[PDB]
């Protein structure tokens with residue numbers, strides 16, 4: 001999910017510009033729901049996932065807000081000590097405590113019902129148990145007991161009119177979420193929100209802790225510890241789910257790392273390229289980053305140094321020279337199915353070979369399979385989410401930096417061979433694979449582009465539409481599920497704010513019983529594909545001026 | 558009027574709600590959601606509570622057990638019972654607004670029931686506050702803020718210990734899954750601030 005906020009000192013023809021691209025995958029009907037709320041202290045406009053009461057993306061005419069995933073570590077697992085005799089009990093601070101339990105019946109259409117039991121300790125629900133060691137694992141969340149208050153902080157924050165009011169609501173949001181601020185005066189801000197545990201000394205948060213009492217959290221860290229910045233010296237805030245701040249530790253997921261190879265550098269380079277940006281230029285960063293190969297930048301210098309002493313007729317060197325002429329932007333050919341340059345396919349095959357020769361060989365099976373993906377894996381329907389740099393590739397990037405990497409190389413991943421020899425071997429693997437399928441003339445290689453599917457199933461895998469409701473888009477774009485832009489104090493209008501968004505396929509998902517599709521069922525789907533957007537209205541005048549219908553209700557509680 | 562809710566839709570069908578108190582405001586919101594996204598909302602409601610196999614059958618029994626084992630519904634109902642009246646109105650207003658449109662749909666199904674209900678063979682039921690809260694918990698807390706792999710990390714660590722011996726197995730683990738990496742590109746520049754805590758990275762708890 002990415003976001004770029006541009007303040008006073010970097011904005012051209014405005015005081016502040018906020019562009020948000022929440023990335024949850026692509027669905028039919030649309031993941032988010034557009035809604036304006038005018039009354040009871042609220043005056044807001046925007047769109048929000050699953051039509052939550054509080055709007056995750058939008059503005060109130062004075063301030064604007066947006067989010068990206070935080071990925072801080074807010075969950076730890078507690079290894080509970082069970083007893084073969086006295087079952088349903090667990091040792092905690094010197095006594096045998098009884099577990100909470102509840103019975104559940106699953107009713108099944110055209111089947112028999114199934115009942116099972118859920119168990120919970122003081123640390124949380126039990127994930128799994130090991131009868132052999134008489135250990136049960138409880139998942140313990142720092143936000144447990146604050147779900148509803150987080151829902152409410154996201155609703156109340158829509159009323160804030162400044163930083164101080166807004167940070168009071170951010171301090172109550174307990175999930176690991178980045179929050180972003182912009183306002184009519186051009187101020188900008190960021191808070192890495194949520195509740196983080198206050199761990200005992202010696203607690204390594206990447207692995208389980210005994211639940212017998214000595215390792216229990218002490219409490220939750222205060223809000224003063226949450227990474228935050230207001231009006232940064234740089235003039236902008238950029239995030240693509242990268243680290244908040246220097247020395248902040250990430251989620252304990254084995255597949256998730258914050259290292260020197262990070263896709264947010266791609267956003268940074270474009271915002272540092274120009275002294276100021278207009279709204280049209282801030283919007284246009286969505287199109288560039290959508291189409292950018294993420295691995296070129298990382299490993300092109302390595303490829304160049306390894307093939308520098310080769311002759312011009314060596315195929316390994318020709319593959320590197322193709323990459324050297326490319327800027328990494330993928331573009332579709334006229335056929336609507338192949339990419340104009342073969343670069344992504346080359347890095348894909350090279351990286352798969354490099355990982356199999358380095359990271360994969362140092363790790364025992366079956367854990368080696370966690371580190372072999374190149375990051376390019378998809379199917380015919382295309383990626384289910386954002387493109388990123390794979391874990392394997394982040395670990396390999398540290399290894400190719402040598403003693404310039406801050407990460408001690410406890411095992412040499414090159415296994416005693418000079419780097420260049422491993423790079424050239426992988427490049428020979430690459431040439432063998434690709435030339436066999438496409439031939440020897442690199443200039444006519446037509447390699448397959450990634451496509452984009454709006455799925456009928458939701459992110460759980462459950463149908464939320466019939467299978468024919470699936471929509472197909474020819475170009476895969478590494479961009480938000482929805483994109484929204486808020487521009488404060490435009491010099492080009494009399495309005496104090498201007499905002500736009502795009503919620504595809506459309507606002508409505510309604511299909512009548514006769515098969516008649518609502519009028520607003522797919523009117524945003526072509527807009528989405530061409531990087532277009534529609535206006536968001538906030539004031540009464542603007543709403544009345546663009547009204548297509550009206551309905552009045554008279555109700556008493 | 559305190560009893561009036563005015564709903565204006567724009568050229569893209571986006572609703573704007575005009576009301577004078579909380580309960581009417583969120584009742585308007587609920588009502589237009591039920592107009593626009595009722596099947597999506599009903600499948601999301603079943604997805605977040607683990608009641609999919611009742612309308613879709615045996616292929617979803619595992620799915621529903623997994624959803625139910627990951628939360629504690631009484632803990633959520635207790636949070637809802639501690640709300641003040643103003644906060645409770647948000648949730649109750651929204652459920653009431655949805656229900657008013659579901660009442661009309663179940664009364665005139667020949668023109669108002671979303672086709673997919675016919676396709677999948679079942680009809681909408683009425684919502685309460687718990688159901689609105691669970692849309693946000695099942696999809697944001699319960700899995701966009703619930704990531705851990707601590708158990709699998711411990712299995713990798715043990716396997717590296719066997720391969721490279723006890724001290725060496727730990728240093729390779731730190732090579733593959735470092736706790737922090739000082740060269741990571743950060744959203745906040747080091748001139749503004751750094752995170753003050755330092756953590757054990759030796760698995761000192763064993």
Ligand SMILES: O=C(O)Cc1cccc([N+](=O)[O-])c1
Pocket residue numbers: 001021022023024056067068069070177241701
């Ligand atoms: O990026 C993600 O992986 C999912 C995610 C999770 C929470 C918030 C998000 N957002 O755009 O606010 C996105």
Ligand SMILES: [Ca+2]
Pocket residue numbers: 073074075076077205206207252705707
């Ligand atoms: Ca943890």
